[PDB]
Fold:
Amino acid sequence: ESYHKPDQQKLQALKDTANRLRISSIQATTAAGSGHPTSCCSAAEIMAVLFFHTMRYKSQDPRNPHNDRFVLSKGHAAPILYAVWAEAGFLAEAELLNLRKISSDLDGHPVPKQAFTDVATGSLGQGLGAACGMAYTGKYFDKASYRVYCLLGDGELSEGSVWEAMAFASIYKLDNLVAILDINRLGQSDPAPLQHQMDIYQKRCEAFGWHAIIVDGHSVEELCKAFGQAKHQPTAIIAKTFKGRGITGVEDKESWHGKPLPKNMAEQIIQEIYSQIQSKKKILATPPQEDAPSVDIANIRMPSLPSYKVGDKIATRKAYGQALAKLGHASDRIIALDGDTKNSTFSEIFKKEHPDRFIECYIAEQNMVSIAVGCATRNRTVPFCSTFAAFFTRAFDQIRMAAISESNINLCGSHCGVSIGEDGPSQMALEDLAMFRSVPTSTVFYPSDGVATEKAVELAANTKGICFIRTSRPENAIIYNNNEDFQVGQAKVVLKSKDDQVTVIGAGVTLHEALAAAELLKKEKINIRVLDPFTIKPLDRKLILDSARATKGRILTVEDHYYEGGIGEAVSSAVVGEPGITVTHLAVNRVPRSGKPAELLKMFGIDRDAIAQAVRGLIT
Amino acid sequence: ESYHKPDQQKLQALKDTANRLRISSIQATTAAGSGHPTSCCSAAEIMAVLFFHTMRYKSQDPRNPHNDRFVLSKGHAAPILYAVWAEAGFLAEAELLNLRKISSDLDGHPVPKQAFTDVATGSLGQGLGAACGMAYTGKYFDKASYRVYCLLGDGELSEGSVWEAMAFASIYKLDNLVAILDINRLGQSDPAPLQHQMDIYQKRCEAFGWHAIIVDGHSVEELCKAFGQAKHQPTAIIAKTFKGRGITGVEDKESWHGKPLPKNMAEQIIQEIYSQIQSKKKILATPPQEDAPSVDIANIRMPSLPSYKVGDKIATRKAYGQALAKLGHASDRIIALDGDTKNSTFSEIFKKEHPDRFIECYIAEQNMVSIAVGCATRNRTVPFCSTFAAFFTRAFDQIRMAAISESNINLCGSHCGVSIGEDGPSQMALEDLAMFRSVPTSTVFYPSDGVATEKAVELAANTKGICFIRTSRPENAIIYNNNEDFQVGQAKVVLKSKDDQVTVIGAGVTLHEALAAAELLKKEKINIRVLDPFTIKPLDRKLILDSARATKGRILTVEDHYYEGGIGEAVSSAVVGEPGITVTHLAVNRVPRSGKPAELLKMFGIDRDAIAQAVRGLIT
Ligand SMILES: CC1=C(CCOP(=O)(O)OP(=O)(O)O)S/C(=C(/O)CO)N1Cc1cnc(C)nc1N
Ligand SMILES: CC1=C(CCOP(=O)(O)OP(=O)(O)O)S/C(=C(/O)CO)N1Cc1cnc(C)nc1N
Ligand SMILES: [Ca+2]
Ligand SMILES: [Ca+2]
Structure:
């Protein structure tokens, strides 16, 4: 646990290592014909000191739960990440030359198909949030000794998501977290705004509650000392570096971001760098203290059936909070995150019952999703984050990168559609189905009553990928019995007869408007089938088609969402070309406005009267 | 003009005004049954001083181009915004009681159907970026004397987008910009992280380059003085306030965010506040100096037809930069914004030729979109912002709010799809069509060669709403004559014969792969019709169906995008139910990986060979 103060030979070996990492970054990107060797070279001493002096990890088991974590937030330096894992003996050195090949897993940016990568980066400014999740988990959940190290670029620090993470780390006293800032003066197409004004970087980090140390980022000695000192808060190592360090004629120059060296130049430069290496002997990694606890990864089962009665009224947003609190007794892995909306999403119910597993993320949806991604790495927790579904659009890039990260997180967005009423469109989620459907690993739950909500929470907990649960503000009736069985991809027909003339597909509030339309239409001797998709993605194509063939081929979809990318388009895409099938679509056609929930459902054509009129038109 | 130091009577009139604004905020939200009176009451003195001492504006012409701008970033304080415009004589006082009614335009959050509103807020943390665009426009484009004032909440300051705007304003020396921070200690569901640690707020603002002044937010005299001194930096007025100020039993208490007072309580409280008001006489607004220049509203036309040659190769990303710079020579209203990607999007070409109208926004896509929205308010500029299309997902909430703001901005996202090759999925836009199609005011251009790209830039300049242009990295052949006519909503049949067996719909790289497939298929005596949509939204439904009816009803869509919300689903939703029409859909089915562009097109089943195989399967 004591700092090992390195001797001159260890320091020279660390320099030798840094220069090997430079050579490999050049060799790999020259072989590929693309990549970012100058972004690797500014970080070479940082990487050498982190992996071969400061960090503790099992070199043959990069995912080991006891290891220190490293997050390469500036992911385009991936070639030097691969180089250090070859230097540590995990990767074959020859494989480095296959960078970016379709036959290789050493892809252009890091991805979790690599055993040594937890989260995909590549979209700048997201790695520190993931690192915050890992550090929060290490400190408060695992209660383990591992530390978390996150390397960022300086242009990258213009992303506001970084400063959300900075503030989070100081609020939650993440003394096990270190950010290393590669202040190499340059971004992609110009100098970074602050260039080498190291004092301003320090003042910004200190103002956000971090211990901030300015170092020469090419001094292995200064780096060892800065990483070695006792930590009492999150620590920012602010490293003055030169982009392309060590590449004569390219160091500190513009016009070289993302440009590989041509073969003739790479050969000449590599010879120069090799001439500075004093010994070929490599440093060994040092293994960690193994105090991370075992975690139970068994299937998660609610401790009891939902306790609703048909006819009771409850909003699905409230049912979500009740279900999540119940799920917290079913598994110790469940954690909840929310962005200062816990009294609106009803995640406050989980906080009341399991306060040690609730993370207040404040008004910072970007960071919230990244925290959850970090908490889910190495399967340590099962995260449920919540806010208004509208404000998950604030975090779409984090959610997009979460799927590239093959992350298992759960996201519950409330207040969907116009049915929230008087707040108006800024709070109305009308594009969240389009957004989450376009996330390739996503399962999209749209529970229509309290029972379906509790079952969706339970299914989501056991479902891999990006799970989204769309909850609602109006208090609708329970329609399902408590022992109704639900499955991903299985819809429910909630009203049917042999004389049905249309299959009406609704969800949430429009499912209940469809049921109300059915009772109205029965007064005119018109029966309609009513179908509740349960999951919008994957869609129950078979039950939808079987239903439509029983109702003269006619489908009517009605949704509290815009036309594009929602339920209607999902259904149309599933059934197009099937003989005799037709699809009519009722949705919200423009930015809405303030009014009572029922008034807005009417104004935008998705209430019981609009459904009934649409049905009448189809018959005639 | 000299500061008019107010006398005691002016100060008392300002206190009276603040208390009138409290009373109205309470009356309106109690009448509506919803809203945020405590969030209004913390800002009452700020609002009184801004509108009736500091700012200069035409009370009967809120949109007037010479006016100071006010941005209510904490938009849920909308009732006090409405109250000040009634106090200024623009709104009828009786109409304030109709807050949130479907019969009123005094909606739950501010929206541009209100003459006194430029940008919709309601999604927190976006107003300061819009204000930065307004101030940048005032200082560097209009070169006018108007100032820009933006009121934020303290919980709101957790949004990273705020800090992007803070940094933007100091980089660009926006000394005409004032941020007022309503530090009322509380957010929605808990205290804000920093509560009343005023010194920490000052340190953070100063570290980001702002002149930061702490004031008693309920002292009209301190506010008059703090607002009365212009600075050489953007100025942060850090106002210590109490939430619900002036409401006995509620001031400084939790559990009251977004809670209206019950009628009996509102009556009692209003009587107490009214007893503090010394005079009913109202202060008059003071008008501005009228030095904003006139702006032409005429159609913008390219100075000449495109000058490409059929057969020449150019990537549409480069054609975009060439076309944008060309358009810049025809109209001085065109401005360009980019997020440190100008060498990759080729917006650098516009920077080279029109540097005064280029805005480097650095690696901060949220703020970039908000800057563009602010620059487009009152039609002062015609903005084109650009980055990789994948990174516009970082700004989806800003884009969503831009449509609620009825904003006319143009967005060009490059590097779409797997055809970028070796960088891998973090850089690959595969959900941008889903995203932008779900924005209700959007027009989605997907140009397939350099000619179509120049035409799309020109059309976008003259089209209202959220215009998106999707550009690509491969260097594909010019296929259109320079004099080909292009229109929004009109597709192009680029290959046909009387013996066509399928209509193949492709765009960008998949249009060219479809043309290559047609050549492979002709060796098998199979002709296919090939259709280029040009705009994905709106879609040329008529030409698609007329084509399909000439090709045995058969449509095949192939796209470098995920399945959901893209070209295939747009087509299927347009044609579903049409007799005899069938649609086969080829898209990217999962997160991709690194390889050469041609290798990835083949791996993910959207290259010429996958297209030909699909055609062969349909005919059988
Ligand atoms: C602009 C940019 C880079 C420059 C980063 O500069 P830096 O100072 O943070 O790092 P180094 O100087 O250490 O390179 S790497 C890059 C890519 O597309 C490659 O990922 N991009 C475009 C980019 C834009 N926006 C986001 C959100 N992610 C990105 N990757
Ligand atoms: C959390 C939250 C508010 C608290 C604002 O606290 P503050 O300290 O900034 O301002 P005041 O104390 O002055 O009220 S108002 C708000 C609403 O849904 C209403 O728009 N929400 C939800 C919310 C969450 N996230 C976003 C991006 N916007 C929001 N509007
Ligand atoms: Ca840099
Ligand atoms: Ca507050």
Remarks:
- The CA atoms of residues 553 and 581 of chain B lie 4 Å apart.
- Chain B touches chain A through 110 residues (CB under 8 Å).
- The two ends of chain B are 82 Å apart (CA to CA).
- The pocket of THD (ligand 2) is lined by residues A 339-341, 363, 391, 394, 427; B 36, 39, 42, 74, 76, 122-125, 153-156, 182, 184, 186-188, 192, 243, 257 (CB under 6 Å).
